[PDB]
Design an enzyme around this catalytic site. Structure first.
Site, short mmCIF file in Angstrom:
data_model
loop_
_atom_site.label_atom_id
_atom_site.label_comp_id
_atom_site.label_asym_id
_atom_site.label_seq_id
_atom_site.Cartn_x
_atom_site.Cartn_y
_atom_site.Cartn_z
N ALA A 4 -8.44 -54.46 -17.89
CA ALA A 4 -7.83 -54.34 -16.87
C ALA A 4 -6.34 -53.57 -17.25
O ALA A 4 -5.64 -54.15 -17.83
CB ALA A 4 -7.68 -55.45 -16.45
N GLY A 19 -5.14 -50.90 -11.97
CA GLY A 19 -6.66 -50.78 -11.83
C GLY A 19 -7.48 -51.40 -12.79
O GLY A 19 -6.82 -51.67 -13.91
N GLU A 20 -8.67 -51.46 -12.88
CA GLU A 20 -9.62 -51.94 -13.73
C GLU A 20 -10.65 -50.87 -13.92
O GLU A 20 -11.05 -50.11 -13.05
CB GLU A 20 -10.20 -53.22 -13.56
CG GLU A 20 -9.43 -54.48 -13.07
CD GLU A 20 -8.91 -54.33 -11.62
OE1 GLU A 20 -7.65 -54.75 -11.49
OE2 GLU A 20 -9.99 -54.09 -10.71
N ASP A 67 1.30 -37.90 -17.23
CA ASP A 67 1.01 -39.32 -17.95
C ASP A 67 0.23 -39.01 -19.07
O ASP A 67 -0.67 -39.60 -19.77
CB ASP A 67 0.54 -40.50 -17.15
CG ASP A 67 0.89 -41.80 -17.95
OD1 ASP A 67 1.64 -42.08 -18.77
OD2 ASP A 67 0.02 -42.73 -17.53
#
Ligand code: VSE
Ligand code: VSE
EC number: 2.7.10.2
Lengths: 270, 271
Positions: A22, A26-27, A133
């Site tokens: 997690a 989000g997961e 990122d």
């Protein structure tokens, strides 16, 4: 071979098998698609992403097909959005480098990892895309140790609202070039800076960047020409590439085409 | 030796400009000597930035705002362009100090100390029914003994909008300014409270830009959807809770500076 005509799929086509972890927004799950296909599913938290905005961007992402980029297979448009990709058996490069098996990879393998990531970022560079990122947590590793870039462009479609603000920092200061922190100028050249930080991550087997330093201390030190010193078991060839990536002027940073070519040379030498 | 309380409008010749401290958008600031014996700061406004009559009218209000946590306004020069003569603050702006070798090492109790000092000055401005209009770390000054004093209180109201000042860019910075002030020109003590919240984030981050990685449009739209800057590293929840109170959407729901000052004083002694 994922079926080319399967893009927007129903939620019921997916059997979530195992929770992989997690995150903030989000997961991620290991799942089975249509009773037969092993996939990964990133389920976004409610409020993290707009369906219309994501789909518009996800239709660009899905065309970014390359051996060093995680394959984006399908999406689920019902709230909250699911992102379906290929499954990468060894998880994130960050976790891999801090695992029993990954902590034992020799220096030539580490260079090979870096060159694979550079090739993927060179593809993104050629396609006039931006990752936004890049870091070891967003690199995935396959069963045969192939590194693939994940979450390319995803930061652009994570919304800033009351829901995501509760999750903390969107982008980590220590990986982000000064001009994107200070001016929001996210470009392929700010990706180049992040790649330099990622290179330090790889050579240190996942150490935090700037050990012992707070985020304000990092910003002010960088402004005065401080850069992370060369660590133990880091060849000078590799450190010199990092220092090129961390030039203050974005236009003076190398291209990923240049980076991949130099990393490829250093691999064969090692 | 303190300033003389009938030397208000002074001749330009009484000032010896010694050293330029920096050039801003609408003026320059100098370290100077007044009448061959008094060390002062002089803010020299760019031609076209201010009207002498409009400034004098406001400067006669500013000069009565005398308080330990406000920079003392000593004198003015009325010949074009206007000079503003104040006490000299040896460690410059709080923004620069927080980004200097010495200021970057101030412990958390000192950062809370700075916040409470500024809140005390703003509580005074609040009690006097005045409005700062441009509160941020760049407009806080720091003395040799680390006293924080509020500068430029009310000055944005007498900066003219014309062909000369338009060339200098944004008058007020979006990321410091309350939404209703941006959207409707609604500058009140409550929009100062919003700005103080952003300043408090500046202090605990040692001068980081507000909303890192975000453009000005991204900040405006995020705020409209309830986004607020998340709590950063080494920011106590007590301090962050004060920021969040300052950033309430409805101005009347923001706390008073008398409240902020009292809560920051409590948190200071606790730290
Ligand atoms: C302590 N660890 C616990 C595990 N945590 C993470 C758990 C999720 C893992 N993880 C994440 C991913 C994963 C899945 C989807 C995804 O979405 C996009 C891909 C490309 C472009 C845009 C979006 C991005 C990443 C993943 C995977 N595909 N296959 C296998 N594992 C995967 C990566 C590690 C990291 C921290
Ligand atoms: C990179 N840096 C370089 C230095 N720059 C600035 C240069 C000017 C400095 N500076 C500014 C001031 C200063 C002087 C006058 C003034 O005018 C008013 C004061 C109250 C009410 C109305 C008007 C407001 C501020 C200052 C100072 N008093 N004593 C000592 N230093 C001072 C504050 C820092 C900031 C950017």
């Amino acid at each position: 071979p994922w079926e080319k005509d399967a893009w927007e799929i129903p939620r019921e086509s997916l059997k979530l098998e195992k929770k992989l972890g997690a995150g903030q927004f989000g997961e991620v799950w290991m799942a089975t698609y249509n009773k037969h296909t092993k996939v990964a599913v990133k389920t976004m938290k409610p409020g993290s992403m707009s369906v219309e905005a994501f789909l518009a961007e996800a239709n660009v992402m899905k065309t970014l097909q390359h051996d060093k980029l995680v394959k984006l297979h399908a999406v689920v448009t019902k709230e909250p959005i699911y992102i379906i990709t290929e499954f990468m058996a060894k998880g994130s490069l960050l976790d891999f480098l801090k695992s029993d098996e990954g902590s034992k990879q020799p220096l030539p393998k580490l260079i090979d990892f870096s060159a694979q990531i550079a090739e993927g970022m060179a593809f993104i560079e050629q396609r006039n895309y931006i990752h936004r990122d890049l870091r070891a947590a967003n690199i995935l590793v396959s069963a045969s140790l192939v590194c693939k870039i994940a979450d390319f462009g995803l930061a652009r479609v994570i919304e800033d609202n009351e829901y995501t603000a509760r999750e903390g920092a969107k982008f980590p200061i220590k990986w982000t070039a000064p001009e994107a922190i200070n001016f929001g100028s996210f470009t392929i050249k700010s990706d180049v800076w992040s790649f330099g930080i990622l290179l330090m991550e790889i050579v240190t087997y996942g150490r935090i960047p700037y050990p012992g330093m707070s985020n304000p201390e990092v910003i002010r030190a960088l402004e005065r020409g401080y850069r992370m010193p060369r660590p133990e078991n880091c060849p000078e060839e590799l450190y010199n590439i990092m220092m090129r990536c961390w030039k203050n002027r974005p236009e003076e940073r190398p291209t990923f085409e240049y980076i991949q070519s130099v990393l490829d040379d250093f691999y064969t030498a090692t």
